[PDB]
Scaffold this motif. Structure first.
Motif, mmCIF file in Angstrom:
data_model
loop_
_atom_site.group_PDB
_atom_site.id
_atom_site.type_symbol
_atom_site.label_atom_id
_atom_site.label_comp_id
_atom_site.label_asym_id
_atom_site.label_seq_id
_atom_site.Cartn_x
_atom_site.Cartn_y
_atom_site.Cartn_z
ATOM 1 N N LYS A 35 2.040 -8.827 2.451
ATOM 2 C CA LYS A 35 1.811 -7.452 2.032
ATOM 3 C C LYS A 35 0.474 -6.950 2.556
ATOM 4 O O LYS A 35 -0.539 -7.656 2.496
ATOM 5 C CB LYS A 35 1.850 -7.335 0.506
ATOM 6 C CG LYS A 35 3.214 -7.673 -0.082
ATOM 7 C CD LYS A 35 3.160 -7.742 -1.595
ATOM 8 C CE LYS A 35 4.358 -7.051 -2.225
ATOM 9 N NZ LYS A 35 4.121 -6.817 -3.683
ATOM 10 N N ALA A 36 0.475 -5.720 3.066
ATOM 11 C CA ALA A 36 -0.765 -5.117 3.529
ATOM 12 C C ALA A 36 -1.691 -4.848 2.351
ATOM 13 O O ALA A 36 -1.244 -4.518 1.248
ATOM 14 C CB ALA A 36 -0.480 -3.810 4.275
ATOM 15 N N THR A 37 -2.993 -4.983 2.599
ATOM 16 C CA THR A 37 -4.040 -4.679 1.629
ATOM 17 C C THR A 37 -4.980 -3.608 2.188
ATOM 18 O O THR A 37 -4.776 -3.072 3.290
ATOM 19 C CB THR A 37 -4.827 -5.942 1.270
ATOM 20 O OG1 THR A 37 -5.657 -6.305 2.379
ATOM 21 C CG2 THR A 37 -3.882 -7.091 0.946
ATOM 22 N N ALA A 38 -6.045 -3.309 1.432
ATOM 23 C CA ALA A 38 -7.042 -2.358 1.926
ATOM 24 C C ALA A 38 -7.737 -2.852 3.191
ATOM 25 O O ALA A 38 -8.337 -2.043 3.917
ATOM 26 C CB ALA A 38 -8.087 -2.072 0.841
ATOM 27 N N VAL A 39 -7.686 -4.161 3.463
ATOM 28 C CA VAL A 39 -8.184 -4.671 4.738
ATOM 29 C C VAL A 39 -7.438 -4.018 5.896
ATOM 30 O O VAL A 39 -8.024 -3.713 6.945
ATOM 31 C CB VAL A 39 -8.074 -6.205 4.798
ATOM 32 C CG1 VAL A 39 -8.494 -6.696 6.178
ATOM 33 C CG2 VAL A 39 -8.962 -6.831 3.742
ATOM 34 N N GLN A 40 -6.138 -3.785 5.719
ATOM 35 C CA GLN A 40 -5.342 -3.131 6.748
ATOM 36 C C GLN A 40 -5.463 -1.616 6.671
ATOM 37 O O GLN A 40 -5.586 -0.953 7.704
ATOM 38 C CB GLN A 40 -3.872 -3.543 6.618
ATOM 39 C CG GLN A 40 -3.559 -4.903 7.221
ATOM 40 C CD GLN A 40 -4.009 -6.035 6.308
ATOM 41 O OE1 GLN A 40 -3.795 -5.984 5.089
ATOM 42 N NE2 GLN A 40 -4.653 -7.043 6.884
ATOM 43 N N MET A 41 -5.430 -1.049 5.465
ATOM 44 C CA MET A 41 -5.255 0.393 5.323
ATOM 45 C C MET A 41 -6.554 1.166 5.151
ATOM 46 O O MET A 41 -6.526 2.394 5.298
ATOM 47 C CB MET A 41 -4.341 0.711 4.131
ATOM 48 C CG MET A 41 -2.961 0.046 4.194
ATOM 49 S SD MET A 41 -1.983 0.721 5.569
ATOM 50 C CE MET A 41 -0.494 -0.320 5.480
#
Ligand SMILES: [Mg+2]
Length: 923
Positions: A35-41
């Motif tokens: 799952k994407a996190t704020a690291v990605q978004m």
């Protein structure tokens, strides 16, 4: 043609940083999706997650992500601190370059003087490029909301602000040039986009460059490191994510794909050289082919006719009986429509020889890595060929069967199996826009072929069709007249071209601009919606389509033929406006919270919607397909039913000249009948003016050309049709391209080296050149290098530049110069030769020789679309929203708290970046 040996491999994939780690994960059936996190978004993903169909929301956060990678910036030919400040896009590509060259044993080798690199890459915003442009839109939104709500209203910054080097906005092409410089490569380099097929396009074209002797070693690879929010919003509007959350390639229950990111690189040599030099050979590339689907399907849907065609072309190219193929690494993404079409294509083709190869998909483990998707597929197949084992496709419980039951789960390993005459594998990739590739691979061997075919000898290219739209010179006839009269198209900024942002005093103060520069802006275009099948497509794609269509008609092209379409471009920097809208969701929520104004949920949504609509329209299906650069080439191939490769090519200002070099190579290595080279840069955007100010001062007044100290604003699109000189008739030819040559670097020495190569290739002497089309960019280091080199090379030739007429069109600038020069030579009534010089941020010098021909070229629901768009401030300050009155009263007379992180403008200040010729970061 000759066997190509893979002599080095590297990967940065979800879950792994080296090929043996990746291989073990496959053997263990590891699932590397997450799952994407704020690291990605750069934001809390839950704030942007909702159901399918919800505006400015994605409905899936699963993907294949690169977690916990810490780039080591030391040990390159560029300074550690410079490389440390670049995006994941650049760092991941540098990582796999170093690892692959070190794997092959050539890191730091003098052999790299004859090594090139071709890099598949997305033309999307990155996490770093956002930082350079968001403050433009959000300062204007902030100031409008101050005028509406409260003089002390403050908008919050879209994410944590970071000081960001301007080179992070050179998203499409510069990463390939950066790899070349940081690794010390002396051969050709460019980036390309063929969507999901870009990795195999890069490998196939790198093999082509080996076959023509343009290089003795090639790096071929790809990187997918776009802003995950931009990617996931796209696949949400495409409804490509599975509604049942099942992403399972080949499985009956799969309802969609998960996307992914990462990078891969391979080192290629002709097998003769690899055996001679004692390299480790991972596998042999026996052959392969490219094709476009042509006409028949929507730009996102695969066409079985193009897939069967690429199979036919690939096994013919490999000279391999399709009966001998044991295993195929499939494109299979988990999307039902695509999985079934690929199974039908394979059934149609391999049933002709009664073969049922095993089938598999590494997208099951990793997700769909987009431009890099072919890298894990090819790596899996090459490692499987060497080791004699085939890993499982994971999560495959109830397999599909092909249309007529030819392929079933009996051909799909779900555990590690032994390998079922050389071991032989196929790899297929079928990208959006109908772009197909298939590569035929065989187990490694030291045994050389006794007989193989060779590339055709090179020939001059004849230009037989042209069109141009530069500023208000909206077709070739108007451009010809403009040039002959030595007029220009310089005008003041069209009212909507910057969405009114030139009226914002804070933005203009940050940009150090007294006014929007006078320049060659395009205010609008007229286009026939009927012919082009136009939720509107962005102007970058419409402009390219119109000039390419007109050039194809002018060149007498015929529908249904093996014709290639190459589009020279860089990213549309206005694409940052989309997240500029979407991110206001949390920016406005945070502002209201921090400043102490408690609106109802409905009031906050209405306020947010008013601000959002000022910045950009919500995502729509067709509009988002026009955010994807390679699709504009596909749209021409679909209109004309062309079957050649259709791609974008990015190499900064030298984009068009790299296309000329590629077109020559395509005629040497394939049966393509013609090549359309189109070019587009809508470089009058506020984003482009902001970006290029970081490299040198703009001419605000828009008014010896090499003595200019400022660059001129211009924009537009143009296209040419080229064929080998031996296959055109005299009355078709504007002018011939007799030579295009390159030299690494940007100084006067590099110019003279490239010029000498090009004059030798053209078979003329410097005294044979009548006039010189200088780059004449107006960036001082480039102008000064040309002031030294060109009068020395060509002391009796006059020097001029088309940029004096239509300004600097950056990624399209090579096309403006070629078309000016071809028109002048077509008019010759005096064997006349003109030299063209090119410099740019790719840090190579291009030099071309064009020559006049025997005859002058013989000629053969419309809607207006404005560039720019709605005025941001007016759309907010004059909003007709009824509930706005009650919101204003919730602000009246109140004391607001200051926000913690207001919009920061620091990244907009002209950064003073030194030119390549200064060698500032060279170690
Ligand atoms: Mg071959």
């Amino acid at each position: 043609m000759e066997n190509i040996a893979v002599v080095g491999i590297a990967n940065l994939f979800p879950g792994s940083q080296a090929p043996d780690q990746f291989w073990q994960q496959l053997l263990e059936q590891q699932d590397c999706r997450s799952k994407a996190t704020a690291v990605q978004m750069g934001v809390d993903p839950a704030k942007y997650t909702a159901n399918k169909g919800d505006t400015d929301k994605f409905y899936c956060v699963h993907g294949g992500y690169i977690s916990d990678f810490n780039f080591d910036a030391s040990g390159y030919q560029l300074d550690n601190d410079y490389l440390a400040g670049l995006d994941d896009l650049n760092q991941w590509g540098l990582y796999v370059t170093k690892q692959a060259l070190t794997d092959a044993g050539y890191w730091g080798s003098t052999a790299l003087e004859n090594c090139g690199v071709i890099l598949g890459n997305l033309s999307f915003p990155t996490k770093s490029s956002n930082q350079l442009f968001m403050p433009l839109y959000h300062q204007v939104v902030d100031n409008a909301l101050k005028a509406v709500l409260h003089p002390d209203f403050q908008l919050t910054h879209y994410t944590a602000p970071k000081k960001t080097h301007a080179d992070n906005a050179l998203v499409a092409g510069y990463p390939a040039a950066l790899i070349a410089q940081a690794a010390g490569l002396g051969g050709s380099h460019f980036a390309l986009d063929a969507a999901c097929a870009s990795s195999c396009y890069s490998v196939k074209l790198a093999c082509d460059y080996l076959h023509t002797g343009k290089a003795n070693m090639m790096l071929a690879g790809a990187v997918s490191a776009a802003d995950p929010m931009f990617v996931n919003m796209g696949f949400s509007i495409f409804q490509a994510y599975p509604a049942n959350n099942v992403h399972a390639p080949f499985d009956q229950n799969s309802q969609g794909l998960f996307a992914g990111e990462g990078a891969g690189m391979m080192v290629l040599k002709r097998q003769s050289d690899a055996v001679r030099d004692g390299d480790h050979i991972y596998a042999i590339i026996k052959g392969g082919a490219l094709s476009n689907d042509g006409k028949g399907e929507f730009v996102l849907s695969p066409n079985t006719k193009g897939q069967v065609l690429v199979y036919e072309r690939a096994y013919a190219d490999a000279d391999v009986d399709p009966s001998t193929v044991d295993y195929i690494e499939c494109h299979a993404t988990g999307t039902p429509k695509g999985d079934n079409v690929e199974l039908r294509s394979m059934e149609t083709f391999f049933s002709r020889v009664n073969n049922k190869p095993l089938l598999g998909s590494v997208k099951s483990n990793l997700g769909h890595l987009l431009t890099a998707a072919g890298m894990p597929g090819m790596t899996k197949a090459m490692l499987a060929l060497g080791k004699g084992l085939i890993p499982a496709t994971i999560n495959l419980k109830q397999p599909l069967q092909s249309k007529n039951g030819y392929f079933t789960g009996e051909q799909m390993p779900t555990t590690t199996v032994s390998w079922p005459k050389p071991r032989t594998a196929g790899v297929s990739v079928f990208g959006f826009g109908g772009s197909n590739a298939h590569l035929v691979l065989q187990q490694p061997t030291q045994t050389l072929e006794t007989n193989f075919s060779v590339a055709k000898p090179r020939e001059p290219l004849a230009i037989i069709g042209m069109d141009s739209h530069f500023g208000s010179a909206s077709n070739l006839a108007q451009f010809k007249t403009l040039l002959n009269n030595n007029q220009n198209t310089f005008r003041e900024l069209p009212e909507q071209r910057w969405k009114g942002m030139e009226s914002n005093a804070n933005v203009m103060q940050s940009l150090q601009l007294r006014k929007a520069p006078k320049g060659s802006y395009v205010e609008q275009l007229d286009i026939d919606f009927l012919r082009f099948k136009v939720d509107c497509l962005i102007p970058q794609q419409l402009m390219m389509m119109q000039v390419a269509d007109n050039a194809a008609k002018d060149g007498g092209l015929v529908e249904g033929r093996n014709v290639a379409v190459l589009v020279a471009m860089g990213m549309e920097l206005e694409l940052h406006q989309y997240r500029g809208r979407v991110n206001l969701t949390t920016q406005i929520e945070d502002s209201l919270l921090q400043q102490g104004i408690n609106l109802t949920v409905e009031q906050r949504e209405e306020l947010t919607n008013i601000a959002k609509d000022g910045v950009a329209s919500a995502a729509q299906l067709n509009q988002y397909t026009s955010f994807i650069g390679n699709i504009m080439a596909s749209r021409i191939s679909a209109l004309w039913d062309f079957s050649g490769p259709a791609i974008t090519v990015s190499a900064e200002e030298n984009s068009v000249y790299r296309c000329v070099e590629l077109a020559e190579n395509l005629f040497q290595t394939s049966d393509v009948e013609a090549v359309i080279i189109a070019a587009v840069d809508l470089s009058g955007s506020i984003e482009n003016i902001t970006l290029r100010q970081h490299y040198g001062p703009v001419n605000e007044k828009g008014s010896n050309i090499l003595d200019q100290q400022q660059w001129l604003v211009g924009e537009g699109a143009a296209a040419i049709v080229v064929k080998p000189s031996s296959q055109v008739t005299a009355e078709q030819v504007y002018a011939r391209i007799d030579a295009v040559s390159f030299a690494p670097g940007s100084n006067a020495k590099a110019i003279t080296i490239a010029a000498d190569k090009a004059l030798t290739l053209a078979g003329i002497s410097a005294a044979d050149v009548a006039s010189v089309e200088a780059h004449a960019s107006g960036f001082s280091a480039e102008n000064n290098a040309e002031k030294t080199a060109l009068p020395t090379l060509y002391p009796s030739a006059s020097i001029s530049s088309v940029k004096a007429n239509i300004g600097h069109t950056f990624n399209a600038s090579g096309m403006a110069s070629i078309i000016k020069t071809a028109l002048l030579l077509d008019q010759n009534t005096s064997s006349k030769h003109i030299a063209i010089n090119g410099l740019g941020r790719d840090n190579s010098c291009a030099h071309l020789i064009l020559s006049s021909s025997a005859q002058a070229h013989q000629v053969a629901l419309v809607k207006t679309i404005k560039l720019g768009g709605q005025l941001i401030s007016n759309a907010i300050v004059n909003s007709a929203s009824s509930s706005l009155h009650a919101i204003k009263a919730q602000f009246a007379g109140k004391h607001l708290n200051k926000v913690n992180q207001p919009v920061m403008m620091d990244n907009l200040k002209p950064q003073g970046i030194s030119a390549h010729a200064t060698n500032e970061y060279v170690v």
